[PDB]
Point group: C2
Chain length 160, copies 2
């Protein structure tokens, strides 16, 4: 059997930090947002601690924007019962997310509360579009109990 497991998925690119519509391609000089989901297995023995997202630009010239302010540069929402219950995504408190790194090529965010079995976190991250070459980002999820690696690669077409 298995004690703990995590999943990651890309949801694509968006024109707003929360709600709004999907985009890609994006015109050079515009802000756009990446969204990723980290999901705890419903069969997990208990809560998972130090659930971390690490996102790095691998290709292209788009940069993660700003200095890393919650509600502007990034947002983290918790769906407490995931797809197993009718509770919706809601923003978490500022004190629940630690910004371990925030730079143009790389961000790292840790969720401090434990993540219950079946619960899902949605991360939204602001980028600045630059160039006529595709931007690719690698997104990696870990917890103390489930180190992974769990990795996706999302690609954005930037119109020059």
């Amino acid at each position: 059997p298995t004690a703990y497991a995590l999943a990651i998925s890309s949801l694509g690119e968006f024109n707003s930090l929360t709600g709004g519509t999907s985009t890609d391609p994006v015109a050079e000089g515009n802000d756009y947002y990446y969204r990723f989901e980290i999901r705890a297995w419903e069969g997990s023995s208990g809560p998972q601690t130090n659930v971390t997202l690490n996102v790095t630009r691998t290709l292209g010239n788009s940069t993660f924007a700003g200095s890393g302010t919650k509600g502007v540069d990034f947002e983290v929402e918790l769906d407490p019962d995931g797809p197993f219950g009718p509770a919706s995504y809601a923003p978490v408190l500022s004190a629940d997310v630690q910004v371990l790194a925030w730079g143009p090529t790389g961000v790292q965010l840790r969720y401090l509360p434990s993540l219950a079995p079946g619960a899902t976190l949605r991360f939204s991250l602001r980028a600045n579009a630059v160039n006529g070459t595709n931007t690719t980002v690698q997104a990696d999820a870990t917890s103390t109990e489930a180190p992974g690696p769990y990795t996706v690669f999302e690609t954005t077409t930037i119109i020059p």
Copy 2:
């Protein structure tokens, strides 16, 4: 003149609608969803818009022999995010299945894809193992060869 985009939408427990999944338990079916999106600034419509999906890691397989409405679905949103028209299924004859096997599928949309329009592809897979499945999805057209590629990953509970 022309440009295309691709995005992963993650994994689902149904071919259309239902809810998001991942992790998946071994022995269950699940569905990958990908979107190909024509640039709204494109000169004209784009022909032979193709999705190629291949397994890069793990043991999960694309399921069945490639029957529309069972193993895969293609939906068109004719104005994409720029207009309030929704996704609707396309006719069986609008989608050419160039390849369909356990490690690889290739699907071509035969009508031309208008500037700003989006295609959403759903593909049935069989979950096997205690190692992550990774799939590579590539989009191409005649006028925007790309290739444009994403890599989506599924946790399989053994």
